[PDB]
Amino acid sequence: NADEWIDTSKIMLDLHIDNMSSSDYIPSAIDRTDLVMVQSVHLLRKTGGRGLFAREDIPKGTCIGIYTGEVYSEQEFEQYLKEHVGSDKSYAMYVGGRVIDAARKGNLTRYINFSDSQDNAEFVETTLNRKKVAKVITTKNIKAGQQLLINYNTYEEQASRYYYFLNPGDGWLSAQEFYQTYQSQYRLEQMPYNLEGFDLKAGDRVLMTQIGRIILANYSLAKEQELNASDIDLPFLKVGSDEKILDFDEADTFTPLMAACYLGQVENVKWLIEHGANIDQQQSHSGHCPLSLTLKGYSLAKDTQKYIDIIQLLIKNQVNLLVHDRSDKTFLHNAALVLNNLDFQSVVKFLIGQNPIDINEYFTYIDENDFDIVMHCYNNKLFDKALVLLAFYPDYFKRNYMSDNEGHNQFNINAFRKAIKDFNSNERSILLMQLRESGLHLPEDLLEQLG
Amino acid sequence: ARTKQTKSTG
Ligand SMILES: Nc1ncnc2c1ncn2[C@@H]1O[C@H](CSCC[C@H](N)C(=O)O)[C@@H](O)[C@H]1O
């Protein structure tokens, strides 16, 4: 057969694969074994998870490969699951009415992990042998050594229950090894004050970079002359009570931009941002991003607008405002709970001044209670913020409640009803009033179906 | 990833 000309053992060896056999590797024609390599992820050392990293730099829009695996139908796969205990849909791709399962046979694509914020690649439907298949396309220019991240385009509660918020910098080196490689840039100091937002107390030994010490001393990074640039996002290494460094799976580290956004150093925030700091860098366990820490500081610190400036700068630098917490609540969901009506309207006005491509992408997200951003405002009796959100997107009901797919329409109707369930007569009356005065031209049938 | 459309292609 022509298979006899494909030695998968050399492919597995060069790609650094150590958990597959020769007969279980299914290669394809567009597989670029020269551009990537399969390595380990120290954050996933307990579960034994691996990942796909870049051996060399890769431009944006480059073909990586095809998701290969065992072929099943939608009914045959359910039968296999029901007949084989222990089988799971973790490696299952539902494409073209077929299921490609890589739980036992696959290629290099099976090692790409999940990310719904820092995804640097995506799945695209293509054709092979006149059959529908899926391919991996890079969405951004990849730097050699970074980990590839992708969006599985599917939701499961177990994911948001204990999926580590992954960053491209998360590699195979441990904390001790990473410090050993960059011992020249790290000094061991003690915490001068307390930090509730980072679980640090006074006197706690912390290994930090010079940029970190400058940020902690409320100094200005611009006033310093010789500042190295490689340690831009080199994080703060915490030291345990046994005088040994806490690992990534043991504690959550943070970057200088995180502490800067939490403290309100607007000028240092701008310096870090313009010096290539990952504005979408997330904590592993908690998932806190610069925007969440900025909101926390806004809620805590008495002076308010100083964090509004940081939020405006982040939006101006096209930060991904679609991040969410483990409660499936986005940045807007939590921001409507911590910002006053005026500052909330100011942030909405910032996003309006940016004028995004599609506004409906901000409303398609739902929380654990199946409430979008408007339903969230109406569940907490935040009527004015819901009004300004409707002012942003006036076609909210026209597109989501009055479309062709009656299923989505009825789902949104029932979600809004479940949200306004715990209302009294006065709140329902003012809600229907504000709906009618809004000039959104709402037909009477929905006004009746809503309640 | 919990959108109104609660691996896959897209
Ligand atoms: N963001 C994330 N954080 C922690 N684990 C993740 C993750 N994304 C995916 N995983 C894990 O990876 C599996 C997806 S298939 C990816 C390959 C596998 N992680 C490996 O190392 O060989 C899932 O079963 C899930 O447990």
Author numbering:
A (entry chain A): 82 to 532
B (entry chain B): 1 to 6, 9 to 12
Q: What do the authors report?
A:
One example is the secreted effector RomA, encoded by the gene lpp1683 in L. pneumophila strain Paris but present in all L. pneumophila genomes sequenced to date. This T4SS-secreted effector contains an N-terminal SET domain, responsible for the methylation of host histones and several ankyrin repeats, located in the C-terminal moiety of the protein, for which the function is not known yet. The homolog of RomA in L. pneumophila strain Philadelphia, named LegAS4 (22) and encoded by the gene lpg1718, shares 96% homology with RomA. LegAS4 is composed of two domains, the N-terminal catalytic methyltransferase domain with a SET fold as described for typical human SET domain-encoding proteins and a C-terminal domain with six ankyrin repeats, including the N- and C-capping structures.
Overall, the P2 peptide follows the same path as peptide P1 forming a U shape, but the residues Ala7-Arg8 that are at the bottom of the U are disordered. Overall, the P2 peptide contacts the same regions of LegAS4 and interacts with both the ankyrin repeat domain with its N-terminus and the SET domain at its C-terminus. Arg2 forms a salt bridge to Asp451 (ankyrin domain) and its carbonyl H-bonds to NH of Ile447. Lys4 sidechain H-bonds to Asn493 (ankyrin), and its NH H-bonds with carbonyl of Thr445. The next visible residue, Lys, enters the active site extending toward the SAH cofactor. The observation that both peptides utilize the same two patches on the LegAS4 surface, one in the ankyrin domain and the other on the SET domain, strongly suggests that both patches contribute to an extended binding site, with the ankyrin site adding significantly to substrate selectivity. The structure with peptide P2 indicates that Lys9 can also enter the active site. However, this conformation must have a significantly lower affinity than that with Lys14 in the active site; because, in the structure with peptide P1, we can only model conformation with Lys14 in the active site, we hypothesize that Lys9 could also be methylated but only at a basal level.
